[PDB]
Amino acid sequence: DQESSGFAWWAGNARLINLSGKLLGAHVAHAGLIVFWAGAMTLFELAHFIPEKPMYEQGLILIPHIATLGWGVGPGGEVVDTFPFFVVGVVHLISSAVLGFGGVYHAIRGPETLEEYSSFFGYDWKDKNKMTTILGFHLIVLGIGALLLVAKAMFFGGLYDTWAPGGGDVRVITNPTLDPRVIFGYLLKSPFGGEGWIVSVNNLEDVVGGHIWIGLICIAGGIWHILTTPFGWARRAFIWSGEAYLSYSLGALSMMGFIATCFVWFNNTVYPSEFYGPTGPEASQAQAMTFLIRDQKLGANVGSAQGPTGLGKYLMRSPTGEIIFGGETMRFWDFRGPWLEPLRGPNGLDLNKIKNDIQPWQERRAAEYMTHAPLGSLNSVGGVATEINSVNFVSPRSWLATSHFVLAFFFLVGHLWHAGRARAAAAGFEKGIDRESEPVLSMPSLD
Amino acid sequence: KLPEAYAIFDPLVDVLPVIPVLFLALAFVWQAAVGFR
Amino acid sequence: GTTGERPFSDIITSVRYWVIHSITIPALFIAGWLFVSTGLAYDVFGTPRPDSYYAQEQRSIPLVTDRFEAKQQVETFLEQLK
Amino acid sequence: METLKITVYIVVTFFVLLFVFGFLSGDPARNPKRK
Amino acid sequence: RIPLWIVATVAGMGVIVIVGLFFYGAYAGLGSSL
Amino acid sequence: GWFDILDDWLKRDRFVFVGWSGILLFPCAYLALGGWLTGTTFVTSWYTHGLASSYLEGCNFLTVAVSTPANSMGHSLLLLWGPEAQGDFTRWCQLGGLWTFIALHGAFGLIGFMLRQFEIARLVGVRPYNAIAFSAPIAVFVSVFLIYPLGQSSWFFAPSFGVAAIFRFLLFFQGFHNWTLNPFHMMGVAGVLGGALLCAIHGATVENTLFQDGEGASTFRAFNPTQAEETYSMVTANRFWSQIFGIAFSNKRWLHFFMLFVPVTGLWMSAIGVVGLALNLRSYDFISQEIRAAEDPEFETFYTKNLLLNEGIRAWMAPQDQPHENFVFPEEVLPRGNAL
Amino acid sequence: SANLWERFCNWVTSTDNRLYVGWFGVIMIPTLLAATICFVIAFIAAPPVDIDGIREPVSGSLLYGNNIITGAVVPSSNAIGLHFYPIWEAASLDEWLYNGGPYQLIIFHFLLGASCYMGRQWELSYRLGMRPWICVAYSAPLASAFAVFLIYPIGQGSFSDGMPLGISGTFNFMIVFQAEHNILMHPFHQLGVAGVFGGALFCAMHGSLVTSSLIRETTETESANYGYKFGQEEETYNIVAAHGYFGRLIFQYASFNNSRSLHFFLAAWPVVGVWFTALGISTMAFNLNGFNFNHSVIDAKGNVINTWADIINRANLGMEVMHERNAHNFPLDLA
Amino acid sequence: MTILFQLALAALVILSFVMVIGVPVAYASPQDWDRSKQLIFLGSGLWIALVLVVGVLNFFVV
Amino acid sequence: IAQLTMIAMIGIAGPMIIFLLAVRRGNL
Ligand code: CLA
Ligand code: CLA
Ligand code: CLA
Ligand code: CLA
Ligand code: CLA
Ligand code: CLA
Ligand SMILES: CC1=C(/C=C/C(C)=C/C=C/C(C)=C/C=C/C=C(C)/C=C/C=C(C)/C=C/C2=C(C)CCCC2(C)C)C(C)(C)CCC1
Ligand SMILES: CC1=C(/C=C/C(C)=C/C=C/C(C)=C/C=C/C=C(C)/C=C/C=C(C)/C=C/C2=C(C)CCCC2(C)C)C(C)(C)CCC1
Numbered sequence A: 001d002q003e004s005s006g007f008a009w010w011a012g013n014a015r016l017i018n019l020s021g022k023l024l025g026a027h028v029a030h031a032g033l034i035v036f037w038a039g040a041m042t043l044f045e046l047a048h049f050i051p052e053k054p055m056y057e058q059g060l061i062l063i064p065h066i067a068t069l070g071w072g073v074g075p076g077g078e079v080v081d082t083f084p085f086f087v088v089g090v091v092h093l094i095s096s097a098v099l100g101f102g103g104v105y106h107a108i109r110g111p112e113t114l115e116e117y118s119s120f121f122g123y124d125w126k127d128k129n130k131m132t133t134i135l136g137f138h139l140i141v142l143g144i145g146a147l148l149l150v151a152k153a154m155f156f157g158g159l160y161d162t163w164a165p166g167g168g169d170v171r172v173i174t175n176p177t178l179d180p181r182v183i184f185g186y187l188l189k190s191p192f193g194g195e196g197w198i199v200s201v202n203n204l205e206d207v208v209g210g211h212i213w214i215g216l217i218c219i220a221g222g223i224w225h226i227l228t229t230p231f232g233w234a235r236r237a238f239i240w241s242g243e244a245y246l247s248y249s250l251g252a253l254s255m256m257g258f259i260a261t262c263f264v265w266f267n268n269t270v271y272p273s274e275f276y277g278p279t280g281p282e283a284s285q286a287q288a289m290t291f292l293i294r295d296q297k298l299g300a301n302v303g304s305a306q307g308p309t310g311l312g313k314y315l316m317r318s319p320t321g322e323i324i325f326g327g328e329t330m331r332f333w334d335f336r337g338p339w340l341e342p343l344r345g346p347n348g349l350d351l352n353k354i355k356n357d358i359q360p361w362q363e364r365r366a367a368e369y370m371t372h373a374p375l376g377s378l379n380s381v382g383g384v385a386t387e388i389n390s391v392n393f394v395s396p397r398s399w400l401a402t403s404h405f406v407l408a409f410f411f412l413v414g415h416l417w418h419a420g421r422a423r424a425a426a427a428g429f430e431k432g433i434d435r436e437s438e439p440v441l442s443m444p445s446l447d
Numbered sequence B: 001k002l003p004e005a006y007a008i009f010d011p012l013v014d015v016l017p018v019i020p021v022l023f024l025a026l027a028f029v030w031q032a033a034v035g036f037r
Numbered sequence C: 001g002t003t004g005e006r007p008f009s010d011i012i013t014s015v016r017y018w019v020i021h022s023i024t025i026p027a028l029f030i031a032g033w034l035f036v037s038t039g040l041a042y043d044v045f046g047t048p049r050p051d052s053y054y055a056q057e058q059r060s061i062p063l064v065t066d067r068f069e070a071k072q073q074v075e076t077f078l079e080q081l082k
Numbered sequence D: 001m002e003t004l005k006i007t008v009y010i011v012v013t014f015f016v017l018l019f020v021f022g023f024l025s026g027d028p029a030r031n032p033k034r035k
Numbered sequence E: 001r002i003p004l005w006i007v008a009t010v011a012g013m014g015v016i017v018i019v020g021l022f023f024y025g026a027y028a029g030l031g032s033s034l
Numbered sequence F: 001g002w003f004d005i006l007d008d009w010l011k012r013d014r015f016v017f018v019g020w021s022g023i024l025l026f027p028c029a030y031l032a033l034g035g036w037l038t039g040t041t042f043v044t045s046w047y048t049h050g051l052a053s054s055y056l057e058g059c060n061f062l063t064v065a066v067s068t069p070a071n072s073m074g075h076s077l078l079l080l081w082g083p084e085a086q087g088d089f090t091r092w093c094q095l096g097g098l099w100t101f102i103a104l105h106g107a108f109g110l111i112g113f114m115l116r117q118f119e120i121a122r123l124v125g126v127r128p129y130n131a132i133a134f135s136a137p138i139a140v141f142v143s144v145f146l147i148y149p150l151g152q153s154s155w156f157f158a159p160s161f162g163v164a165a166i167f168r169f170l171l172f173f174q175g176f177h178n179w180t181l182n183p184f185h186m187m188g189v190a191g192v193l194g195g196a197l198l199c200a201i202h203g204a205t206v207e208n209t210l211f212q213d214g215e216g217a218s219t220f221r222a223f224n225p226t227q228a229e230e231t232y233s234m235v236t237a238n239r240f241w242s243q244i245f246g247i248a249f250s251n252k253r254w255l256h257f258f259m260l261f262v263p264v265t266g267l268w269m270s271a272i273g274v275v276g277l278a279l280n281l282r283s284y285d286f287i288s289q290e291i292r293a294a295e296d297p298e299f300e301t302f303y304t305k306n307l308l309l310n311e312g313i314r315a316w317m318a319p320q321d322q323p324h325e326n327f328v329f330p331e332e333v334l335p336r337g338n339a340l
Numbered sequence G: 001s002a003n004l005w006e007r008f009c010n011w012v013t014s015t016d017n018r019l020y021v022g023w024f025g026v027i028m029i030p031t032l033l034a035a036t037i038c039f040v041i042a043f044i045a046a047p048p049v050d051i052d053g054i055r056e057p058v059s060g061s062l063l064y065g066n067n068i069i070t071g072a073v074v075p076s077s078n079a080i081g082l083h084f085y086p087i088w089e090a091a092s093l094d095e096w097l098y099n100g101g102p103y104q105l106i107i108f109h110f111l112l113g114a115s116c117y118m119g120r121q122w123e124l125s126y127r128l129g130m131r132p133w134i135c136v137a138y139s140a141p142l143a144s145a146f147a148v149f150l151i152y153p154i155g156q157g158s159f160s161d162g163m164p165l166g167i168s169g170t171f172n173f174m175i176v177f178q179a180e181h182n183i184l185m186h187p188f189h190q191l192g193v194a195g196v197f198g199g200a201l202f203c204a205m206h207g208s209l210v211t212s213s214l215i216r217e218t219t220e221t222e223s224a225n226y227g228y229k230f231g232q233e234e235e236t237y238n239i240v241a242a243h244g245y246f247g248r249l250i251f252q253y254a255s256f257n258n259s260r261s262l263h264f265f266l267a268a269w270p271v272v273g274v275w276f277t278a279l280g281i282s283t284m285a286f287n288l289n290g291f292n293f294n295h296s297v298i299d300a301k302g303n304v305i306n307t308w309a310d311i312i313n314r315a316n317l318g319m320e321v322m323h324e325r326n327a328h329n330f331p332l333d334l335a
Numbered sequence H: 001m002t003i004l005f006q007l008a009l010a011a012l013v014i015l016s017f018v019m020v021i022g023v024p025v026a027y028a029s030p031q032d033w034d035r036s037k038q039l040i041f042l043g044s045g046l047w048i049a050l051v052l053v054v055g056v057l058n059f060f061v062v
Numbered sequence I: 001i002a003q004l005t006m007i008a009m010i011g012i013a014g015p016m017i018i019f020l021l022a023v024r025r026g027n028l
């Protein structure tokens, strides 16, 4: 049916732009690949998983995702029951077969087009009504999903809260922040140092609460699109084509890929340092803690200790006056963490709490995170580029952050590529300049 | 680790993750067979 | 667009080729393998075996220090069970 | 100093408004053929 | 006559195997660190 | 005459053109490449650098190398039958005889290859601007792998044939020569970087100013292999860059010569800089800067910063990088900052 | 007036302007002008900057003892880190200049403008009816500016660790980078030089081949360039004679005969290569560094047998050990 | 029960292997998939049951 | 110990489901 007289081999999938039927098979077979990975990898991780050992020291990125949702973990991120991990893995792996079935079917057996075999499912790219409607469908599906999280948190068990009063533990959220002023306030927050925008979320109340808003808002917009069409400006502004719609979603993912990168690197809450590694700042903060703790035990007055620059060996001030840790760690004075907070006062680090309220669990926590900074090599050799082979380790925060930046970027390129093509395809010169009517030759010489 | 029973299948699960990649490769096998149309 | 040589495509496809090369190609492979596994390679290029970098106690390096009597000097380095 | 902040903000708003209302003003139309 | 697409796919896998053998050797041979 | 019959055969249009040049090219080129691949897997650098340098010893594609001879050798050609190896092959390998082997053979292989360019061009009846261009890579190889060590103490300080072994050559030149601060090197990178820009920008320009000569989207098939009309709109290309950049080409003949000039000129400038480094005539310091830095302890530039990096590089590397010197640097004499 | 705003939009979008001020231009032009002006004034007259936040001001301007090679615009203080530091965030300009205020103003304005510059490289192509993707080629050098000026500071947690705006300052960034990350031993970097070397290579390749296979239309004592007129119908060089030569240099099938497949390769290679090198810096912005083969090969007893990788490590330590003298108080450099 | 579990679980593997190769060549060559529509259906149906078997049978082994 | 037996089968499985199609000739 489709061959060289449509596109080139290396652009094969573009031959399916107007083959609704087969184009559905792709998406259904693809979605199977995603479920397959999630499933098969979970089982791979579990098969290697060692309970009496930190997750971040085992190259895990899916089991800690399950852990956050309050599953198989307890006090301090202690792994209690590995069964929920096994379940989530096998169930996915099974569902991948179901999806894969449909994918293959629709791609090589079922109707090559849908428009005739069912007018409901068949579609036209330029059909602004069908497009907004299908969009409306998914806008609800995603909306319910946002509520699936809220349910797990408020009813079906809770989430792992590192900020737990008694110390990190699975907690049932029964007081979601529903105040719009608070919720949507995050969106009006700066993206720089201190004010951290979305990544600055520091409690599960907002997380669960925010998801309630998103869930409702999403479904609400889902219904809106079912019962409407794009307005006037909405039509005179956008490009309406199969490729154009793709481009719009490509840049969308690119943007989300960048946001996710900063989330796993900075955020402490939705990315627990108990399951993942300690965040970058957290680790540098820990070293200052460690040696402030050591030297003070040797009889050093940390408060008045003068470093080489005359700035403050252990403690100094932030540009706005707050008492912070000294050294190169002055850049990470924006760090907040369960282990460190009880030492913080109304003006920053309290010299009195530092002098005699340091707890043992804090000292070894600082030591742990200090010796597990997200520093490593490609071949997984933990430490600085000059370190010696011994400790085979690379923080999961590093793996995730790097991988998703590469993906986010290339998708921005994919965006530009597909958005540039769509504009030329529409106007109709994406295949070359008309030899006869060459536009430039009709424009006055600027010389 | 895998539940005591499934331990026999431990070696099997060790390879499963790589399978998706094969699909990307397979697509090239097909195109080669059909003489790159 | 053509020269005397027989089109690769035909040869890599001919049954005769593989009848030949199913023998020849692995042969070379096994030969190279033996070249290492029999330790011959170590002697052909004077490459030290894992137990032949130092003497037991010695931790110094057998650095060649003069050009003309280098060969003799090298031989002397092998003497100390190196 | 608090003034400069205001001035800048106004300035940036201007160009940013010119940008959004720009592509909105039927930009796909502006091209050689099909529009 | 042996179909070209088979010749490549077999020689293809044959390459992935030997090179993959090399990558294994990076964690076992003398090129290890243990 | 046998000559013209010998000529006839050589200059015959085959799959792989031989030619008179081939009598020099193919033997050396093969031996150079072969010698490397050999040493890469089998021959060691223990007796010469106190280093493992082959797959046989456990090195990988990055760490493998054909290391330079000992400093004791001097600038000796290190012939297999020379006073050093004395006909022995095993000794020859252990004394780094393969290095001078690869270097000299490869040197003649580069001569043969340009000769091939000259010879083939003449036959086909085209201009030898491909031979002129290839002079830049020659100058580099000649200046770096030959002239440079010829100015130093021995072949030992020449770049060893290998991935990692080249990286140290970079770090060395930084630490010892302050090579980045050299005007001739800067022109070098400007040519390479600027040349890699021309490559990109021109290709992209052409592919996106093409005429429509087909009905498919994959416009590759739609090209006429037999000249005739320009496949891309030169006039459109002109007005474009003239409006986005302000300046634009308008003479394909100049545009392409420019693409030759830039990267070839750069490589040549970088060569001259290296020729000066042979005599250690480097661009290490700025006297006006040092004089102020001496009298004034609060004067600091990014230039001053870099020199401190060099001091660290020299001190910490020299012991294991120049074994023949029997360096012994006590912990206390090692230049160090605070904490680190 | 047909409508003021309607006219305005027609003027902006007008393809009859000497320089195409696009809609992206409306943002580009002002931002690039602020960046450049602030830069020029700084590079010449800006006072020393306490880059490492350790009250150790680094002078990088001409009037303060620098020359072109040494001179630079010094990154913002490490005391500021990733905090936003506009002029209206300082008690005074004296303070603003001391904490490296100009740097942020420049990099932010540049990166913004340089992005719109890419956006404009699409717009003009759209207005002239030519294919896009030229801007896609420019995304590679831009993605590098982004990685070096924005991504790495974000990753490392401070703009003080961003690449300085100067010659020697650029050298410092590299040397230090190598120490902390071992970039030479990283695949993405290696792909970068491959693209850059190959680029210069292919640039000379294409350049020479074409210029060498030109059709004769010039005198013996006349510039060979005049044998071409702006706005020709037919080609000015024999691409079939070019292919005939290069096809014999190596071997026929390893030679291009399709100008379109040629120029695509000419564009694809460096862009892709630089794309990885940009991703390299962006990846090592989260401390996923190059290969660490330190003390890998050891002998039968356990003695450490050195490789070139070890010799590299010694050079790296020296950089590490000496950089930022008085900035460190603790054993591990986790910043 | 244990062996009975290993039977069902292992058989579920070989069937899937057969199914994964089967369904493709089935839909592909139009020489039938009407007689194989019988085969595929039995394979699909059986598969689901097997999964449910291993499902319930799991809480009995581990 | 040696799960290379697995990979092997699942690896040749890919080209098999199209090889059998080169035999039964259809729908490629
Ligand atoms: C949602 C994501 C998405 C989707 C649905 C599409 C869909 C499409 N793209 Mg596309 N694209 C995307 C993201 C996406 N793209 C991104 C992020 C980029 C930036 C790199 C591109 C760049 C791009 C280009 C440059 C082109 C397309 C084209 C196309 C169309 C034809 C498909 C094709 O060429 O397949 C063919 C698929 C291949 C040849 C496979 C390529 C293999 C990749 C390059 C290697 C991946 C490395 C891998 C991870 C390593 C594996 C290891 C290996 C040893 C196994 C199709 C509409 C083509 C077209 O016609 O434009 C309209 C075209 O020319 N796209
Ligand atoms: C996510 C990956 C993916 C997916 C889902 C698809 C999907 C599709 N591609 Mg495709 N493609 C891809 C990647 C992908 N492609 C890449 C990377 C390239 C570049 C090399 C191409 C190049 C390409 C070309 C050149 C063409 C397609 C075409 C098609 C469509 C028809 C397929 C066909 O001809 O069947 C043929 C099927 C076979 C020959 C048998 C293959 C065996 C099946 C499909 C796989 C079995 C899966 C599994 C092992 C079985 C599980 C069973 C279990 C559930 C029981 C289909 C929608 C064609 C098109 O436009 O449609 C008209 C077309 O001409 N593709
Ligand atoms: C993208 C998301 C992602 C992330 C963050 C991780 C992260 C991780 N994986 Mg993982 N994995 C992924 C996807 C991902 N994986 C996928 C899709 C598969 C299926 C193939 C696997 C299969 C897998 C296995 C089987 C294992 C891991 C392991 C690991 C851990 C160790 C990482 C390591 O050593 O890799 C190092 C890997 C590399 C250095 C390879 C980098 C390859 C790059 C991306 C190629 C780029 C080249 C480019 C595409 C060329 C194209 C250009 C061309 C077109 C011109 C780590 C937590 C290991 C583990 O858990 O043990 C602790 C382990 O055994 N993963
Ligand atoms: C992306 C998902 C998707 C979509 C849009 C379609 C769409 C279609 N499929 Mg299809 N299919 C899919 C996945 C999908 N399929 C999968 C995964 C499989 C493998 C099991 C199949 C197997 C399959 C077969 C075997 C056949 C189709 C057919 C069809 C067409 C007729 C409609 C039909 O059968 O519905 C009829 C059924 C309904 C309208 C109701 C189904 C509702 C189910 C039971 C519940 C689903 C629950 C869901 C997961 C949760 C959503 C609820 C949430 C909002 C709260 C239609 C174009 C037929 C065809 O080709 O005819 C043209 C056909 O014979 N499909
Ligand atoms: C991802 C899901 C999704 C998608 C793809 C769409 C898609 C669309 N919606 Mg929509 N919508 C959604 C969810 C979604 N909707 C939800 C959940 C709701 C409920 C709140 C709505 C409510 C809604 C209404 C009420 C309307 C649309 C309309 C539209 C159409 C035009 C949109 C437009 O021109 O924006 C272009 C946007 C601009 C020109 C403004 C740019 C200024 C932005 C907002 C700020 C800058 C963004 C910045 C970079 C990001 C920083 C974050 C910020 C918080 C700081 C388009 C088809 C319109 C339509 O045609 O109706 C059918 C319309 O009137 N939507
Ligand atoms: C034509 C191609 C060619 C060229 C130019 C070279 C060039 C070289 N090879 Mg070489 N080589 C080649 C092919 C070639 N090789 C081949 C095919 C092999 C594989 C067998 C080798 C194997 C090889 C080895 C194993 C070694 C070299 C070495 C060398 C270098 C020194 C050799 C020397 O002193 O030359 C001597 C020059 C001549 C003999 C030319 C004499 C020609 C005259 C006209 C003949 C006169 C003879 C007559 C008896 C004189 C009478 C005078 C009377 C007073 C006695 C030199 C760069 C050495 C090296 O690299 O050292 C580091 C080395 O060890 N080569
Ligand atoms: C020394 C000497 C000599 C010489 C000898 C010779 C000449 C040898 C040769 C040898 C050789 C000639 C060898 C070869 C080798 C090769 C190899 C070993 C290869 C490998 C490859 C690979 C491994 C690949 C990889 C890859 C790539 C690169 C691409 C991508 C993908 C892949 C992965 C496939 C003589 C005796 C004369 C004399 C004395 C001295
Ligand atoms: C078994 C089993 C399973 C699985 C299944 C599956 C899912 C499968 C798949 C499979 C597959 C999916 C496979 C595939 C494969 C593929 C391949 C293996 C490919 C290869 C390729 C190649 C080799 C290439 C070649 C080439 C070259 C190189 C060049 C160019 C041309 C060509 C392309 C030819 C389950 C889960 C049930 C369970 C367990 C058991």
Ligand SMILES: CC1=C(\C=C/C(C)=C/C=C/C(C)=C/C=C/C=C(C)/C=C/C=C(C)/C=C/C2=C(C)CCCC2(C)C)C(C)(C)CCC1
Residues within 6 Å of the ligand: A025, A026, A029, A030, A032, A033, A036, A090, A093, A094, A096, A097, A098, A099, A100, A101, A103, A104, A107, B006, B009, B012, B023, B024, B026, B027, B030, H009, H012, H013, H016, H020
């Ligand atoms: C369309 C197309 C394509 C694509 C395809 C696809 C994408 C497919 C998919 C497929 C799929 C997506 C499949 C899936 C499957 C799955 C399965 C088959 C499952 C299995 C499961 C099981 C078997 C169970 C169980 C278990 C457990 C629970 C544990 C123990 C072990 C085991 C695993 C046994 C290609 C590119 C090639 C070419 C073109 C056409």
Ligand SMILES: [Ca+2]
Residues within 6 Å of the ligand: A047, B010, B011, B014
């Ligand atoms: Ca296992």
Ligand SMILES: [Cl-]
Residues within 6 Å of the ligand: F305, F306, G172, G176, G323, G324
């Ligand atoms: Cl420094």
Ligand SMILES: [Fe+2]
Residues within 6 Å of the ligand: F202, F206, G206, G210, G263
């Ligand atoms: Fe050109």
